[PDB]
């Protein structure tokens, strides 16, 4: 069914992937790298005290606060979803090997019984109606760029100035580029404007993963994580093998002389890709407006901020079902990519822009180092984008693509299993648009609050309600997959976008509340993904600019968790036995310190002023900028804080740009 070409770094096709500069050349040869993460200025994640602290706290919390999750996966009581062993990993040390990314997922979908394309005309109308509601009345906006950020594949530059340049030149030439593509001149478009090429794979860590304490042996066991080797990846699973990567860790001892206490492991690594900025810029100029519209006009189902921005919605429902989807990104269907491009064309949209968009979701992938001595290889031929890897993490609109699939998948799941009486409202595009529009505004008996693969499906009073309870029981039996498009089930310990839905004895949304997941605070504070980077001066270009500020917002964020205080105590205690020190004291100092420094950045903060006029979200963000990529967005944060992390291209230039792509 097609092996997918593969080229080594020495091949010319791989070489054209990196400009003739130092960073690019080094990015193409970066070999496997491993090392203890600097959890806080001065403390290494593998510091024997810290590990010790981790052992005591992970066992104490597990033992004093076992999880309260009923069989329908609702959490109640203490608000704990599972044990606390997740923190038992030697952070900056990965499982081995990381997976190779699958070149084609068509077979993965088939063997999992997911469909080829819409299974019925209704579904086809819906997916399509979504594209119309989402791409119709866009308003230009400044193109925003993250300060840390790399241009990726062609130049691997991080200088804002150069980024602004590339972006602007990209909005000017985006059109000759897409036309060259429309005639199949991918190489030209890439050589002349750096649009095309490949995504650059980088393996990111998942600091915490899931460890189990076997009672039969009293020894811990990690959740096996399957990964594909080269053969497996280039043949879509037809050949090669799929296996469990080793999270062992014991090797850290012979290799680095590092002490690995019992029951600690290498953290899992998930593939992540950076696309070529020249191609993403044309795409982000469309995606930011689209986000804007769906967070405004359809704010009901798509825009979420505070734990209470959520309860307001879930509280009205008579039955809330919290879903979970398996492997969202690698199962995401190319046929949806094609359906979407098709609709956009039908609605107007410059065909050169659509060509650009389709191509960004089919680009080759270049892998750096999934493991020691392994592959610096290009999967896919840039001359003819062919990959069907299913949704790249660095494509300009990953969140949009995922939200659009799914949002509709849940709808279909609701219409299919509970509201057949709604089917007659979807007869043609107009009625579909009219229905979907009504549905996302929360005006129907079936509702939804969702973001990519995280959702909360809802039912008010009505005919749909009795079905719904069936859907739910269907999910609890886990025997039949409820959708034709993605493998869906219920989340064991339902939560939406960080927050857990805490149910009382009643077991009904109406009397349930949304609290913060205490487990998260733990992950955040004792297993960050990245170290604090004292190495970099400009704290804005640091993965974790002001780790200290989190303390100023903990309360607001995790306060309602039933065990909040008990946890802070366990920490103070366990921390004391490992450092003869006071965490808190430790944290307050860090708070003062970053608070003070923060002021050198917010050019509007009276030098030694305080955190006075800042959002709890502002704090969490300045302490951890990812989140601006998966929880919140530009408008959720104050503007004074925004400039500290972002910079942009003139609204003027995007507007000129949008005019030429927009239908009207
Ligand atoms: Mg969830």
Three-state DSSP at 420 gives: helix
Q: What share of the chain is helix, strand, coil (3-state, %, to 5)?
A: 45, 15, 40
- E strand or H helix at 211: strand 211-213
- C-alpha to C-alpha distance for 627 and 630, rounded to whole angstroms: 5
Pair 474, 480: CB distance under 8 Å: yes
- E strand or H helix at 516: strand 513-516
Query: Which distant-in-sequence residues (6+ apart) come within 8 Å of 637 by Cβ?
Result: 615, 617, 618, 621, 628
Nearest to 435 by CA among 37, 129, 640: 129
CB burial string 282-314: b at 16+ within 10 A, e below: bbbbbbbbbbbbbbebbbebbbbbbbebbbebb
Pair 230, 375: CB distance under 8 Å: yes
Pair 158, 148: CB distance under 8 Å: yes
- Angle, CA 432 vertex, CA 426 and CA 438 arms, to 5°: 105
Pair 310, 320: CB distance under 8 Å: no
Helices (H) and strands (E) in the chain, counts: 25, 21
- C-alpha to C-alpha distance for 534 and 597, rounded to whole angstroms: 13
Binding residues: 453, 490, 494
- C-alpha to C-alpha distance for 234 and 316, rounded to whole angstroms: 48
Nearest to 411 by CA among 327, 323, 494, 333: 323
**494 Cα to the center of ligand 1, angstroms:** 6
Pair 365, 391: CB distance under 8 Å: no
Nearest to 104 by CA among 275, 232, 204: 232
Phi, then psi, of 242 in degrees rounded to 5: -110, 130
Beta bridge partners of 151: none
Pair 7, 13: CB distance under 8 Å: yes
**124 Cα to the center of ligand 1, angstroms:** 26
For residue 300, give Cα distances in angstroms to 221, 314, 413, 441, 514. Answer: 42, 11, 19, 5, 17
Query: Which distant-in-sequence residues (6+ apart) come within 8 Å of 600 by Cβ?
Result: none
- C-alpha to C-alpha distance for 11 and 272, rounded to whole angstroms: 23
**262 Cα to the center of ligand 1, angstroms:** 32
What secondary structure letter does DSSP report for 366?
E
**204 Cα to the center of ligand 1, angstroms:** 21
- E strand or H helix at 220: strand 220-222
**497 Cα to the center of ligand 1, angstroms:** 6
Nearest to 289 by CA among 451, 136, 453: 136
Three-state DSSP at 200 gives: strand
3-state secondary structure 446-507: EEEEEECCEEEEEECCCHHHHHHHHHHHHHHHCCCCCCCCCCEEECCCCEECCEEEECCCCC
3-state secondary structure 623-646: HCCCCCCCCCCHHHCCHHHHHHHE
- C-alpha to C-alpha distance for 298 and 275, rounded to whole angstroms: 29
What secondary structure letter does DSSP report for 245?
P
Query: Which distant-in-sequence residues (6+ apart) come within 8 Å of 461 by Cβ?
Result: 318, 445
Pair 501, 456: CB distance under 8 Å: yes
Nearest to 616 by CA among 559, 536, 543: 559
Nearest to 277 by CA among 141, 182, 157, 175: 157
CA dihedral 187, 189, 194, 197 (to 10 degrees): -40
Phi, then psi, of 663 in degrees rounded to 5: -65, -55
For residue 135, give Cα distances in angstroms to 182, 205, 343, 655. Answer: 21, 34, 10, 15
**324 Cα to the center of ligand 1, angstroms:** 6
Nearest to 203 by CA among 314, 99, 57: 99
Query: Which distant-in-sequence residues (6+ apart) come within 8 Å of 524 by Cβ?
Result: 550, 624
Kindly list the domain boundaries of the chain, sorted by start residue. Answer: 1-30+102-276+333-397, 37-91+518-606, 277-332+398-517, 607-664
**590 Cα to the center of ligand 1, angstroms:** 32
Pair 380, 389: CB distance under 8 Å: no
- E strand or H helix at 22: helix 22-29
| Rg (the chain; Cα; Å) | 25
- E strand or H helix at 213: strand 211-213
Q: How many residues does the chain have?
A: 664
Nearest to 658 by CA among 282, 340, 164, 181: 282
Three-state DSSP at 188 gives: helix
Nearest to 8 by CA among 160, 230, 157: 230
**267 Cα to the center of ligand 1, angstroms:** 22
For residue 343, give Cα distances in angstroms to 131, 404, 423. Answer: 7, 13, 22
- C-alpha to C-alpha distance for 623 and 488, rounded to whole angstroms: 33
Pair 141, 289: CB distance under 8 Å: yes
Does domain 607-664 sit in CATH 3.40.50.720? no
Three-state DSSP at 221 gives: strand
Three-state DSSP at 403 gives: helix
- C-alpha to C-alpha distance for 547 and 649, rounded to whole angstroms: 28
**79 Cα to the center of ligand 1, angstroms:** 14
Query: Which distant-in-sequence residues (6+ apart) come within 8 Å of 587 by Cβ?
Result: 548, 551
- Angle, CA 361 vertex, CA 147 and CA 137 arms, to 5°: 75
**460 Cα to the center of ligand 1, angstroms:** 20
Resolution expressed in Å:
2.5
**517 Cα to the center of ligand 1, angstroms:** 11
Nearest to 411 by CA among 475, 497, 484: 484
Residue 599: CB atoms within 10 Å: 17
Q: Would the CA dihedral through 176, 179, 181, 183 be positive or negative? A: negative
- Tokens 């193409």 locate to 28
Query: Which distant-in-sequence residues (6+ apart) come within 8 Å of 51 by Cβ?
Result: 259, 261, 264
Pair 313, 303: CB distance under 8 Å: no
DSSP 93-129: EE-BSPPPPPSB-HHHHHHTT--SS-SSHHHHHHHHH
Deposited experimental method: X-ray
Nearest to 647 by CA among 596, 603, 613, 609: 603
Query: Which distant-in-sequence residues (6+ apart) come within 8 Å of 185 by Cβ?
Result: none
CATH superfamily of 37-91+518-606: Phage p2 RNA dependent RNA polymerase domain (1.10.490.60)
Tokens (6 digits) for 509: 């949304």
**455 Cα to the center of ligand 1, angstroms:** 6
Three-state DSSP at 581 gives: coil
Burial environment of residue 477 by CB neighbours within 10 A (0 to 12, 13 to 18, 19 or more):
exposed
Three-state DSSP at 619 gives: helix
**493 Cα to the center of ligand 1, angstroms:** 8
Three-state DSSP at 304 gives: coil
Query: Which distant-in-sequence residues (6+ apart) come within 8 Å of 217 by Cβ?
Result: none
Cα of first residue to Cα of last residue in the chain, in angstroms, is 42
CB burial string 442-462: b at 16+ within 10 A, e below: bebbbbbbbbbbbbbbbbbeb
**457 Cα to the center of ligand 1, angstroms:** 11
Give residue 603's Cα distance to chain centre.
31
Binding residues for Mg(2+): 453, 490, 494
**333 Cα to the center of ligand 1, angstroms:** 21
**641 Cα to the center of ligand 1, angstroms:** 28
Tokens (6 digits) for 107: 């077979």
Q: Cis ω on the peptide bond leading into residue 97 (within 30° of 0)?
A: yes
**210 Cα to the center of ligand 1, angstroms:** 17
Query: Which CATH class, in words, describes the domain spanning 277-332+398-517?
Result: alpha beta
């Amino acid at each position: 069914p097609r092996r997918a070409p593969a080229f080594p770094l020495s091949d010319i096709k791989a070489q054209m992937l990196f400009a003739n500069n130092i960073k690019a050349q080094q990015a193409s040869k970066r070999s496997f790298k491993e090392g203890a993460i600097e959890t806080y200025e001065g403390l290494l994640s593998v510091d024997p005290r810290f590990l010790s602290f981790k052992n005591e706290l992970s066992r104490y919390l597990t033992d004093h606060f076992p999880a309260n999750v009923d069989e329908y996966g609702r959490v109640y009581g203490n608000g704990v979803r599972t044990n606390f062993f997740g923190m038992r990993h030697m952070n900056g040390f990965p499982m081995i090997p990381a997976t190779w990314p699958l070149a084609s997922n068509l077979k993965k979908r088939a063997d999992a019984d997911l469909a080829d394309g819409p299974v019925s005309e209704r579904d086809n109308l819906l997916f399509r109606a979504a594209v119309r509601l989402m791409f119709s009345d866009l308003e230009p906006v400044p193109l925003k760029i993250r300060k840390g950020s790399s241009t990726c594949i062609p130049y691997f530059s991080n200088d804002m100035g150069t980024k602004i340049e590339i972006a602007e030149r990209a909005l000017e030439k985006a059109e000759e580029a897409g036309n060259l593509m429309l005639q199949g001149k991918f190489d030209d478009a890439y050589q002349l404007h750096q649009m095309g090429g490949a995504y650059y794979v980088v393996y990111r860590a998942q600091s915490t993963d899931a460890i189990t304490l076997d009672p039969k042996t009293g020894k811990f066991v990690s959740k096996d994580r399957m990964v594909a080797d080269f053969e497996y990846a280039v043949t879509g699973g037809e050949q090669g093998s799929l296996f469990a990567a080793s999270k062992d860790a014991s090797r850290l001892k012979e290799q680095y002389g590092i002490d690995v206490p019992d029951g600690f492991f290498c953290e899992r690594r998930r593939t992540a890709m950076g696309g070529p900025f020249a191609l993403n810029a044309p795409i982000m100029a469309v995606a930011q407006p689209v986000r804007n519209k769906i967070y405004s006009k359809y704010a009901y189902t798509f825009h979420h901020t505070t734990r209470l921005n959520k309860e307001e919605k879930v509280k009205e429902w008579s039955l809330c079902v919290a879903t979970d989807v398996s492997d969202h990104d690698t199962f995401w269907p190319g046929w949806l990519r094609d359906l979407i491009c098709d609709e956009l064309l039908n609605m107007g949209y410059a065909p050169w822009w659509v060509k650009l968009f389709e191509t960004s979701l089919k680009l080759p992938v270049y892998v750096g180092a999934p493991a020691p001595e392994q592959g610096h290889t290009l999967l896919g031929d840039p001359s003819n984008p062919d990959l069907e890897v299913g949704l790249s993490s660095g494509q300009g609109a990953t969140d949009l693509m995922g939200t659009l699939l799914m949002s509709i998948t849940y709808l279909v799941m609701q219409l299919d299993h509970t509201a057949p009486h709604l089917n007659s409202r979807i007869k043609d595009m107009p009625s579909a648009c009219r229905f979907l529009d009504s549905y996302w505004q929360g005006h129907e008996e079936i509702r939804q609050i969702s973001k990519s693969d995280d959702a909360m499906l809802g039912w008010t009073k009505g005919r749909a309600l009795v079905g719904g309870h069936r859907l739910f029981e269907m999910l609890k039996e886990g025997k039949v997959n409820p959708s034709p498009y993605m493998k869906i089930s219920y989340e064991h310990g339902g939560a939406f976008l960080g927050d857990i839905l805490l149910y009382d004895s009643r077991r009904e949304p109406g009397s349930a509340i949304f609290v913060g997941n205490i487990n998260s605070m733990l992950n955040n504070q004792f297993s960050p993904e990245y170290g604090v980077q004292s190495g970099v001066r400009d704290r804005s270009k640091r993965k974790r600019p002001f780790p200290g500020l989190a303390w100023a917002s903990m309360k607001d964020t995790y306060g309602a968790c039933p065990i909040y205080s008990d946890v802070l105590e366990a920490i103070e205690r366990c921390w004391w036995n490992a450092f003869g020190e006071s965490y808190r004291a430790y944290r307050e100092d860090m708070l003062k310190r970053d608070t003070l420094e923060l002021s050198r950045y917010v050019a509007s903060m009276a030098r030694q002023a305080g955190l006075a006029e800042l959002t709890p979200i502002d704090l969490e963000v300045l302490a951890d900028p990812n989140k601006l990529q998966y929880k919140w967005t530009e408008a959720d944060v104050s503007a004074n804080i925004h400039e500290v992390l972002m910079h942009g291209v003139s609204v003027e230039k995007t507007e000129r740009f949008l005019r030429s792509v927009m239908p009207r």
